[PDB]
């Protein structure tokens, strides 16, 4: 039974950076991404 629902906005998943004191995070891989951007001219 689908209906209209009103809810508070979500600003994104709550993530807490594991900011240690003498620890650093370094990637071991990557991902090439091709985004898009459309501008009226």
């Amino acid at each position: 039974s689908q209906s209209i629902i009103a809810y508070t906005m979500s600003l994104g998943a709550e993530n807490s950076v594991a900011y240690s004191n003498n620890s650093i995070a370094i990637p071991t891989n990557f991902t090439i991404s091709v985004t898009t951007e459309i501008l009226p001219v």
Partner: protein, 238 residues
């Protein structure tokens, strides 16, 4: 290359099915069409006159009496035209601002590599490709995004012989037993040597400086040849 090919393959599915983008050009077209439609529909209003057709007023009235109705319709249509021209001028200013932005994006992302953050895509910008769309332009920002992160234990410098050895490029990391020197956007651990480190002062000022051994290839080769020379001298003597 496989990643780029897969990404370019998905550009024809995440452009016309997820909505989001491609609504700005259609919005421009819709705004222009709606403004023109509203302007053309104002010819059916009376603005207080007796009819919205000038031929009817001309036919049914004497000139001196028809002057008033003609003037009323003139005032109404002139107001409508002024409103249309003002809205068009403001829209033209906005479109020109967008076109200046588009030319800047072309020059600084297609005709070169951009260090401006998030100007030419979410990530580290590699290149962009332009595409022509009706009354607009479309960019395909190729970006480099780090994916799989493993966090090590770091340190600002390495005090080997009472001297602080900072990294020439990259950061110091350790997996638990040994310390390496890796670049900053990719895990490529390298043995800490004097070639990729420079010394500035002792290890009494740097906070968090970590003891390790800084490998010296020159001294290693010198000791390797010195040991052989000493052995040869000892054999010659006795």
């Amino acid at each position: 290359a496989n990643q780029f090919n897969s990404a370019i393959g998905k550009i024809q599915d995440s452009l016309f099915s997820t909505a989001s983008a491609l609504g700005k050009l259609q919005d421009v077209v819709n705004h222009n069409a709606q403004a023109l439609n509203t302007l053309v529909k104002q010819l059916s209003s009376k603005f207080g006159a007796i009819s919205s057709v000038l031929n009817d007023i001309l036919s049914r009235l004497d000139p001196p009496e028809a002057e008033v109705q003609i003037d009323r319709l003139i005032t109404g249509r002139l107001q409508s035209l002024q409103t249309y021209v003002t809205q068009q001028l403001i829209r033209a200013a906005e479109i020109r601002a967008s076109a200046n932005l588009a030319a800047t994006k072309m020059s600084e992302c297609v005709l070169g590599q951009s260090k401006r953050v998030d100007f030419c895509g979410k990530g580290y910008h590699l290149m962009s490709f332009p595409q022509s769309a009706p009354h607009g332009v479309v960019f395909l920002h190729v970006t480099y995004v780090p994916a799989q992160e493993k966090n090590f234990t770091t340190a600002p410098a390495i005090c080997h012989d009472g001297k602080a050895h900072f990294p020439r490029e990259g950061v110091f990391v350790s997996n638990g037993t040994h310390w390496f020197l890796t670049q900053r956007n990719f895990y490529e651990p390298q043995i800490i040597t004097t070639d990729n480190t420079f010394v500035s002062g002792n290890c009494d000022v740097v906070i968090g400086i970590v003891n390790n051994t800084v490998y010296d290839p020159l001294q290693l080769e010198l000791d390797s040849f010195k040991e052989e020379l000493d052995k040869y001298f000892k054999n010659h003597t006795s």
